[model samples]
Every structure is written in C-alpha cells, then in structure tokens.
Target chain A: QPGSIWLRELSREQIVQAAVRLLDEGGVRNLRMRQLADSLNSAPMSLYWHVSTKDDLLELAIDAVFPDPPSRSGTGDWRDDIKAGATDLFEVLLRHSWMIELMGGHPPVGPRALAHTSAIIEILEQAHFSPRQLDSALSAIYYYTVGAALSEASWQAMARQSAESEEEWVSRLGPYLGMATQSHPASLADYVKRSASSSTGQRFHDGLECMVSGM
Target chain B: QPGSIWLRELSREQIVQAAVRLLDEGGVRNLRMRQLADSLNSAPMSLYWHVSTKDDLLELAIDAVFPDPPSRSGTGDWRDDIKAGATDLFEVLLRHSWMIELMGGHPPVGPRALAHTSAIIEILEQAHFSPRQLDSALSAIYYYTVGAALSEASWQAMARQSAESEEEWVSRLGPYLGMATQSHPASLADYVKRSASSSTGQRFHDGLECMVSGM
Candidate 1:
C-alpha cells in the first residue's frame, strides 16, 4: 500500500517470479496489476516501475517457463530429437494452458523461445535439411504440437466442466455417432466404435510417428 | 428489450443465421444474447426460448458455417481428395477464425461437423485404410490444418495490431533473430534469412505436403 524506497530494492526477477506464480494459479485474465503489486508487498505504482505493462509482464512470465533448450537430448537421430522437442512442448502447453492463447498475440520472441527454436533448427540442419526445409520442419513440429495440445486441453476443459469420467465424457458425444452415420452409413460408425478403444496418448503418438517419418 | 410476442414468429434458422453474422463480426466474447435479440428486433427473453443458452447458440452458429461435406471433391486419388478437404477446412477457419476457439470447447458434434467427418472417413475407407489407420489419418489432416490455420491467423492478428505491411511486420521480429543467433550462431540466422524470402502460403503447403505424405 505504502511506497517509498522499496521500489529501488524490488528486483525484476522478484516481480517476474511473483507474476509466474500468479499466472499459474489464476491465468492471464485473472491476473491484475494491482493484485500483483499487493502480492509483492508493494504499491501498484512501484510495480509499474519494474515492468512497464501487463503485456510485458506476460511475455516475461511465459518465456520464463520455456525449457532452456527444449530439445537437448544429444540423441544422434533427428527424428528422436524432433519427437522429443514436440512432446516437451505438448506437455508445456497442457501445464500452462493460458500460453496457447497468449502465444497468438505475442509470438514468443523472448530469449528462451528463440533458444528453443535454435535447438530444433540445429537438429534439422544436422540432419541435412535445406534452409527452406528447416522452416517447414520447425513449423510442422510447432504447429502439430500446438494443435494436439489444444485438443487435449479442450478435452480436459470439457471434463472439468462436469463430473464425467473420460469414457462418460466421450459417450456424451453419442448422438453425433448416429448423425455421422445416418447419411453415410457403416464405415463412419465403425470408425467411431474402433476409436473408443484407443487412448489419447496412443492417438497422439500415432500422429507424431506419421509426422516424424513424413519429415 | 421489449416483450417477445414475436418469439413464436421467429424461426430457429433465422436466429442461427443472425447469430452467425453477429459472431463473424464481433467474435464470441462481444456477441451477447441481448445484442443479438436487439439485432433481431425481438425480446432478449425470447432469444432464450429458441437457443437454451449462449453456449448452445455458439455451437449452432459455428456448425452453420461448415460445408455439408468438407471433403467432397470425388477425386479418385485419396491424396487429391485429402488435400482438397484439408484446404477447404483451412480457408473456412480463416474466414471464421473464431471457430478455432469455439471448436476447442465444442467438439463440433453438429450435423454439419459429423457429416464432414463422415465424408473423410468414407474416403479413407475406400482407400483401404484399416480402422486404426483411419483414426490417425483423419487426425493428421485435421490437426495439421488446424495448426497451420492457427499460425496464419496469428500472423494476421499481429498485423492487425498495427499499420505495418507484411514485410515490415516480419522485420519487426528482427530482434528475435539476434536473440536466436546470439547463443547458437549461423544455422538459425540462415534459417531466418531464408524464411523472410518465402510466403506464408508456401510454408503452409510445404507442411501440408509433409502431413499428407506422412499419412
């Protein structure tokens, strides 16, 4: 509430760390600058001196969570390294679901984001991908991971909306099975029945296998 | 704002069509029930009688835009048919970009959505994909197109934030190139230069090529 000399002592790291904690718990929309200042044991005005704006704070907090070099396994195989990197990103998006939306507006141009990209670019380059192929290769990994994570996150979100078990949650989509097959008949209905027997993890790996091999 | 004697006069098709227009213009957050009612020249309470809730209305509006059968090219080659289907979905997402977020919460169980899925499943079936391969094949197309569209959508969003031309918009990312290369030198920097010379369409098709071949 009261501010005088504390502003001088408050480190950017202290502010960003506090922000990361707040973001993890409340997400982006729920994070308020005044609330952040109060949480930091300082005045709102003093907090402004540390990070110019909420958007700046968000960029800093997002990059803070990115692994130093997302794919550093030192595995000689480019496919393994690519899979590792995409899988790591997939997990990260689930943990910090808010990152998915924020990434749209702020394209992760921070130090850590660049470092993550650099790691993958090295893997592809070493694998003899031309510069043009590197662009597509990196994008394929990033976009697929983003897309898969978004779907998983949405599934988790829907489940959180109610008390349904995963099977029950999917079963709720039962009406569409009839709709899907009503006009097309046997093949789609069969596809739906078979799909029920698989796990989300299995589906993700199957697509990832296709992606890496395709590369 | 007024009493809804007109509620009985209104058709579900009219309400949904109005909602699609509203959604396309203002996106989900800005498309309030009251505003939609006012636009329709009906009472707010009357709107509720037709579509049970805002979420249900959103679902109806989203599905209204989906093509009756997304992959209906009837091309004999599965690859051509698959490419046609994915590209159609990609352009649809761009035209109704809000579909991306709504699709996360709503798994597109609408009649149109299921029909779209059915068409693709039939194609994969005719191509002799087993039940398991069909699951991954469908997912690969869906996820890749979703991922590619999301990236393009984000790029458009960033450009909308300012008056910068496309080249200028990418050039603004100059700082990250330095950041990306500062730690890992030549290869990444070369990647950046090469990326600048290409177009987004080129990148998307390249990835789509990988995705289709991967399947």
Candidate 2:
C-alpha cells in the first residue's frame, strides 16, 4: 500500500488529462502549476516530468480538448457533409472561445488539428476541388469558422461578465446606436433592435452556405 | 490669460484621440484610466467626464482605429467593390490585432461601424440582393474577415514575442504535423503546408471572392 500510494502514479497522459479539466475551468491564464497541483493532489515539479513547460502542457491540452470529430466518413452528400463538418467546428470553437486566443498564437499541427485538417481535405477532395484550390478552400472554411466563433464567443463572454441581464446588455447599445445612425427614433430603435435579433448563428449558416457554393 | 490657458484644452474628441494613441500602444487591457490621464497630463477621474467606463472608452478607441475603410463607395462592379472594402478592413485589423479582443467583447455600433454597415447595405442593395439576404451577407463577410485577421495577427504577435524567425516558428509545427499525418502525407501535407503559404491576404481574397460569387 505504501509503495503503490507513495510513488505518485503520474504519467504524461494523466497530467494532460488533469490539465484539460483545469483549462476548461478557466482557460490558460487560470491553468497554473500550483492550482493544477492542488487539483491533482500531486507536487507541481513532478508535472515537469511529463510536460516540459507551461507552454508545452498547454499545447498538449489544446490538442486533447479539440480532438477530431468522431468520423470523417462523409454523409451521402459531400456538400452537406462539409456543411455539417464546418458547423460542428464553429460550434466547438464557440463553446471554447478561450481556445481562440491560443489558436491565434499556435499553428495547431498536433494530432487533433491534423486529424480535422485531413478529414476536411478528404471531404473537399471528394467534393471535386481542383488540386490547387484545396489550400484556399481549407483556409476559407477554417477562417470563416474561427472568425464567426471568435465574435460570437466574445459577445457571449462579455454578456456573462457584465453586471446586467442580456437584454440590459444589448439595450445599452441604444445610445451608441443613436449616435452612430443619427436616424429617427422609430426607425433607429427598430434597426438597433433588429440588429440585435440577427443571431450570429443565422449569419454563420448564411456565410457557410455562401462559401460552400463559391468553392 | 491664466484662466484661458489653464482650462487644459480638453474635449471628448481630444480625450478620444489620446485614448486611441494609448490603445494602439498597448491594447484595451493596458489602456488604463491612470495611463490615459498620465499621457494627457490630467487626473484619472477627469477621464470619467469624457467616457463613463473603461468599456466605453474602448468602444470609442476601436471605432477610431477601425474606422470606415475611407469610403465603402463600392465600385460599379459590386462584387469587386465589396472585396476591396473587406480587404482594406482586414489590413487595418491586421495592423491592430489588439483591437480584435476589444471587438470580440464590444459590439461596435459607433459612427464608423454604422457608416460601413450602411455602405455595405448600399452596395448589396445596388447589386439587387434580396433585402432578406443583407444581414447574412454582411455577417459572412464580417466573420470571414475578422477570423482570418485574428489568426494572422496572433501569429505575427507571437513571433514578435519570441526571438524565432517566421520560418522557425513554422518549422516548429513539423513534429506535430508528423504525428498528425503519420497515416498519410502528400495530400494532407500539401493542404497543411499550403495552408502555411496561403497568405492571410490570399485566403481572404479567395474566400471573399467565393462568398461574393455564391451570393
């Protein structure tokens, strides 16, 4: 019992698994060695045995968190499959907005990123994109997904952070919108209110469709 | 004469101008009331007279930095015009990545944002897209531009933070890529490596063209 308990049952996967939980809890800024140690009930220095540094651990953590979708096996319709894939990606990024900052900084060639990348390539290949067009096409989908998610995620996060309700948060746009539009009260208020109604999700589907057809 | 010279020559625009400079220097997080006051040679509380809170000031600063792209006066070729407008916006955002974070948090409905919105509406209207398609089209373009710029900007910023050259930064992706692509190479590497080469500019244009054509 002493031998089993005292040796510290630590492994690379074990550390990474715990780190993922911490990362999900509060993102990169909150995932420090001390807190992670507390979470794991292990010494911080021992973590270095599996992951060389904070950045290294983070790199691993991100890959683990953003694994490839369950299957790349496209549905019967290639276009629909690609659409489904992109939508899944956008939703994932939306839920994990904190991951956006790291993405901006990291190239993401790890297994998960690559798996998704490969799956996309396969789907696009099946869709009949020219050899030269693959990169641009991939970039288009990736950029669109990320772009939409970043804004959507950011908006949601700010709403959560504020002291007021979501309605209050948006209503606050009234004065600024008035200053920006310089329109009549009836029309200006309608537009500002209407603008709020335009869901990021609606915009995303619209944009994704546009990209798919254009490709 | 003492009183006339003593007013310190402050105005909302003056404070906004100073805040813009500070924002460009260090982004929203660093653009503190204290620093804005120090830079303007005034007390921190005095800033409250101009902008009510840090968020308010940041909203104004983002608008100023990401102003209307000097004329959304779309060229007769509506597609080309929209592309030009978006390209300009992307370049500006690239130059000021810090703004991305502020933007993620703030829904800019300031004069600048409104002005651009109206212009895009004009272009799409002139092109005869259904009124229903307007928001979706605008959103798609906006999301694609913001997303691509966020990634490009993050990469550049990370490079500056480290001593490594761009090639080094990219080459660091190799090990991970190898692991990710172990099952295959040619097509996947071509796609991933090619993604590396596809300038955010190229991808931006390509994606923009795709969306415009699809629309």
Candidate 3:
C-alpha cells in the first residue's frame, strides 16, 4: 500500500509534519521511526537523515502545533491580548494532547514556541508588572492553561476509548458515584451536580479570568 | 531477597503499599502484576484476589498517596485552609509523579481523594462564594497546582535521568539555548535570564496566592 519516494525529496519539514499526524492519531507512545517512515512512503533511513532522533522530531512537532503568535493588538489592553494567547495555546494542546508530554525535556524555544512566549511576555510588560511579578504571573497563567487542558484532554480520551458520549460515559459512573458518596454524602453531592450543568470550557474560562484579573 | 510471604497473608493494603513503592521508583510503565507479586514474595494469582487488574491496583495506590484530609482549621480564614490543602496535594504529587497520569482515567472518588475534595469545598464555602463561582475557583486552584507540579516533576525527571544536579542540568542547555536564540535574539533573553533566578516553589506559591486572592 506504499509508493516509494526519492530520499532527497523528503525534507525535514515534511518528515516533521508526518510525525505530527501520526502522533495525533496514536499519541507519543504509538510513534516509532519505522512506522512514521512507512506512513510517509519513505524509508526509515531517509526519515533519519532529516530528523536524527524521535525526541528531535517531537520537539519540532510540539512547536508546529502552536498557532503563529498574535501580533500586539496595540489597544494597550494587556488582559485581552494575554487571554487570546492563552486561549489559543489551550485549544492547541486540546487538539494535540501529546505536546504536553514533550514539553519538559526540551526548553520550548522552537521558532513558534518562542513567538508565542515572546508575545505573552510583551503583553505582560505592557501591563507594567515588575520583573519578579511578571515571571510569576506568566507562570500562573501558563500553568493553569496547561493544567486545565491536561484534565480536559484526559476525560476526552476516556470517553473516546469507551466509544461513548460524555453524557453516556458519566452515566456509567453512577454506580461508582453512588458508592463514593455514601460515606460522605454532603461533600461531593453539590459539586458533582453543578459540575454537570456547566461546561468544562466555561470553568476553564472562569479560572483563567480570575487568575488574570488578579495579575 | 524477598522472604516467602503467604498469599493469604498479603492484605490488599500491603499489595497497595508495595505498588506505590514500585510506582515511585519506576513509574506506571515499569509496573507489572507479575513483578509486583514477585516483589511481595507472593504469586501472581494471590495478587488478583485483592486487586483484579492493574487499574484497580493503581486506583488503590492513588488513594494511598493522599494524606488524611485536613480537619477544618475553623480560623474562618478560607485562604489559609485552601492553601494548605493545595500545597499538600502539590507536594504529594511531586513525591509520586505517576499519580497525575492516573487521575484522568478514573474519577478520583477514593476516600482520601474525597476527603481532600470535601475539605476544599468546605473552605470555599466558608468564604461565601456563590455555588457557580465556587466550582470555578476550585477548578482554577486545582488546575494551577497540578500543572505546576507536572512541570516541576518533569524537569526533575530530566535531571534525574541525566544524573546531574539541577544547576548542572540547566547548564547543559547553553548550547541548545544559543542555537534557539540566534534567530530570535530579543524574544527569550530576559525571560530565560530571570527564570533562572527564581525558585520553582516561590513561583508556584506566588501564582497560587494570586489565584486564591482573586477568588
């Protein structure tokens, strides 16, 4: 089911693009050089020429997922600009959940990652936060965004793996929910009921707003 | 070196304890029921009696890592209680980094998890947050804490694997940092320099305080 391509024709960019697709479908664990090469209709050796190791390919893929950083809005409204940048980042992580796994080992200085980071810092600077506060505020927003995305993505994976709608998936938890609540009926009852009514996105937005407003 | 422990003598609690130790040293991937049983000096069959699957054992292990949830501080200071709760949760996750991976697959309804959840809700309630705002506030704090922990744990892992001190590990990034900054000199210079000065704990605490105060 594969057609051969000339090794010279495969560029680093092309290989990285294919790797991203494979990662989205099966996650970081499912990706292998041999498998990625097969998907590209190129030999594994050819893939290696452009991307020396899986980690290198992964770093490229992580940067590729970020949207080009937003240009300064020039409205001098740092809140709006920062929110937009954070929202874009959260949405990107949601789309490609695997990116979070690769973030730790590599400093995210890829061109796109740098662009987004640069934009965020610029927005913070416009607000005139002191050097220490600036870093703390950025870390706060970044941590919250990634954390919310991680939780949201995990729940989505559970539903996907179960082949069920979120509602149906939650319904299946009724038995466990009942058992868990029996010992401490008052603790989780209201929280669980309210959590169901509001969307996860709304909760994330609310949290982000609170964090940003404090900044 | 494991002494023979009778299968019947292996309580569910004991198996879970062993599982946690193994998880800490090697992570979720390195854990196998057979290996766990061997470590306990019990056959694999004995393990299935108490924990039917790896996921079940993992669930038990997850709950085990949580400290007994704090009794209300009754100081009527919601901020203090919430901070204590968050810090405890964050510290535990750092100690057992694998717990974050397990959280998404299961609803954290374990007794310990529920107790911690209940205490947080009670603290928030004392502050008189409206029902909707309360959930968002809790989500914000929880997400921030976990996100910070994840990032910290990852950097620690990178250091551990490389067998380098934190300072030395960061030093190794010099070459990569130079290459990355060449194209975008102005972008990451200040952020990178300042990030080196602050401790990760202080950043996390600052961010947590900002989020909690906003609430």
Candidate 4:
C-alpha cells in the first residue's frame, strides 16, 4: 500500500505488536518477515532495524503471552501459589497455542519466560522443598505444564489443518478408532472417545496437583 | 542402478532401515524417496510399491526406533514399572531423537506406537487405578516424557545447527545470561548452568517421581 504508517515509525514494540497480531491470526507459517513488514506498511529492512532476526521476534512474542503472576490469594500455602501460577501459564498457552511449537525448538531464556520460571521457583522454595529438590521440582512442573500445552496445541494444529473443526475430528474418530484399537483397555478406549472436551487446562490442573502432592 | 538388487527385491523393511539411516545421517529433509532409492541402488518409484505414502514409511520408521517396553520387575510397584517404561523410551528417544519432531505433528497410531501405549495402559491398570485415573496418568506420563524429550531433541538440533553442543551453549552463555536475566533468581540461573550435566534421563527421572508422587 502507499504511505504506510508503519514505514516511518520503525519502532521495535510496534513491529512486535504487529508480529504478535500476525502470529495470532495465522500460525507460525503466516508470520514471515516480509509479510510482517507489508502488514505494518513498512519495508523489511526497516522492520529489521528494530529486531535482528525472526527468532528474536518469536522470543519476544513468547514472553508477551505470559500472564501476570498471581498473588497469595486466600490460602498462604505453596500449593495454592503453585496451582495459580500453573493455571495462569496454562491459560496463556491455550490462548497463544503457537507458543507450544515455538517453544519446542527455541530456548525459553526471554525476560518473560525467566520471570515466569522465577515465580514458580519462589512458590516451590516456599513449599519447604530441600535445596536439592528445587531444581528437580522446577523441571517437573515446567515439563508437565509444557507437555500438556503442547499436546493441546498440536491437536489444535491438526484440527486447523483439515476441513473439519476439532470437535468433529474427535467425535468422528470414534468409529475408526474402535476398529483400529483392539489392544486398548475399555477404559482407555472410552477416554479416547471423549477427547475433544474443549478447554485444555483442567487436565493440566489435575496433573499439576498430583505433581505438587508428590513433591 | 538398473541391475540393483534393491530394484528387484526391494522390501518394506529395507526401505525403512535405509530411511532411518538417512534420518540419522541427514535429518528429516534427507529422507527423500529419490535419495533413499539411490542409497538402495534402486529406482525411486520402486519404493511406492510397498509404501503408499511417505507418511506411511515415516510411521514405520518412527516405530522402528521405539525400544521394546520395559519388563515388570519384582516388588512390582506401579511407580517402578512406569519409571522403567519411561526410561527405556527415553533411551530410544536419545538414540532416535528425530522422532520428537515427527511425533510433534504425527499421530502415534502405528502398530508399535499402539503397542507401546497399550503396554503403558496395562501397567496403570495393574496399579488398580480407576478407569478415569488410568487415562489421565497415561496422558501425564506421556506429556512429561514427550515434552522433556522434545526439549532435549530440539536442543540437540539447535546445537547441531550451530557450531557448539548444548553444553557449550550453556557454558558460553554465563556472562551474557547473567546480564540478560535480571528477573530470574540466582538459583534459577545456576540451575540453567547445570542443565548440561547430561543423564538427560536423570532430569526426567526427577520430574517423573514428582509427578508420580503427586499422583
């Protein structure tokens, strides 16, 4: 387009906001440097001035999705704090499901990611974990939260790839899955049938509590 | 190439083996039908005889790298059994790390994948878990293992992409990390440094115990 507003500004945050919007509307494939520049009505070189690389923009986008950490709320227990932190993170992951794939390959060393990690650490340390246990505890919680998010995100991706919505994919699989899976236990089979329960965090919350109790 | 042994007697297993080798040597992009045929000294079209699609061949290769499930040792605690299975899978993952990226997008519904899932189900069922608990437990362990493995596999990929290994990446970043990560705690920073201590399994083991313990 002519006389693009973004071309003259050349701001980092401006580029990031537009990048986030692109990532939101389309998946990772849609978030291209040239395409992003066009969306901003700017040249690719001008956008590059603020961000060195696409990876840098992605890292920024990742940190942007993290919600504000929770306060002590009603209970002063570490368990509550841990649950709240996990729930908030889970919510963000669900909103920006693209983060799951981005995170799979990229290091989570950005400012927001670091801040989130430290918040979890604070809760665990308050939980009376031995100094030796802190690292393990942190890794476990992070792994579980991320793993759950990735599965949901991946499933969403698969849903988006096809002509059908996620609900249709899950419910429609019932017949084919029954024919294919003879070895599965009845319980397992039954669980698979109800796969598209929509909101993905309750399961994460359940696993998180089990992990917290185990800790 | 006209008189190639693979041309006349090309087998599905042979293609899968060569495909796996190609993956090990060249990553996913290298596992092409034309190049794979050349490796077999055969024509690319011959591959289509046994495997209808690349996804099918890929599904087979994915299963090929899966280690056999762990046996139920004595004392037979469910925790012990689950940990054993996970550890075996982890070893296989490290060896065939490419599976992480592939599985991120693919449905692990092939024969071996199904077998592995059933084996896990049997263990959880043996533990006398309720039908519902069994599914969630399975999901939890799976998510944790896959998430952890993906991180390691992706890290190895990044290392391969660059001049250094993950250890080098971690060690070299200290001075720079110290400055960038002000929001992170000192312990968290130290934790990142020790991330390369290896045993990749140990990190998994610690998390698994917590998740299991919490359960």
State which candidate has the highest DockQ: 3
Please give each candidate's TM-score. 0.83, 0.79, 0.87, 0.83
Q: Write the residue-wise lDDT of candidate 2 on A6-81 in tens digits.
A: 0122788788888877877787778889988887888888887767678777767666667455354535476777
On the 0 to 100 scale, the lDDT of residue A56 in model 3 is 71
Error of 4 at B94 (Å): 2.7
Clashing pairs in 4: A210-B214, A214-B213, A214-B214
Among these predictions, the greatest TM-score belongs to 3
**Residue pairs with clashing backbones, model 3:** none
Q: What is the lDDT of residue B149 in candidate 4?
A: 78
Residue pairs in candidate 2 whose N, alpha carbon or C atoms collide under 3 angstroms: A147-B147
Question: On a 0 to 1 DockQ scale, where is model 3?
Answer: 0.38
Give the per-residue Cα lDDT of candidate 3 at B141. Answer: 78
Q: Which stretches of candidate 4 lie over 4 Å from their true place?
A: A1-9, A70-74, A156-171, A183-185, A196-199, B1-9, B154-171, B180-183
> How well is each residue in A6-36 modelled by candidate 1, as lDDT tens digits?
1222988899889988888987777899889
**DockQ of each two-chain model:** 0.36, 0.35, 0.38, 0.35
Of the two candidates 1 and 2, the one with more favorable lDDT, higher being better, is: 1
B111-207, model 4: which lDDT tens digit per residue?
A: 5665677778788778888866776787788778877776665444323234677666665555434643455667666665555444546677877
Between the candidate structures 2 and 4, which one is better when assessed by lDDT? 4
Clash count list over all predictions: 0, 1, 0, 3
Is candidate 2 or 4 superior in TM-score? 4
Instruction: Classify candidate 4 by CAPRI docking class.
Output: acceptable
lDDT, residue B57, candidate 1: 79
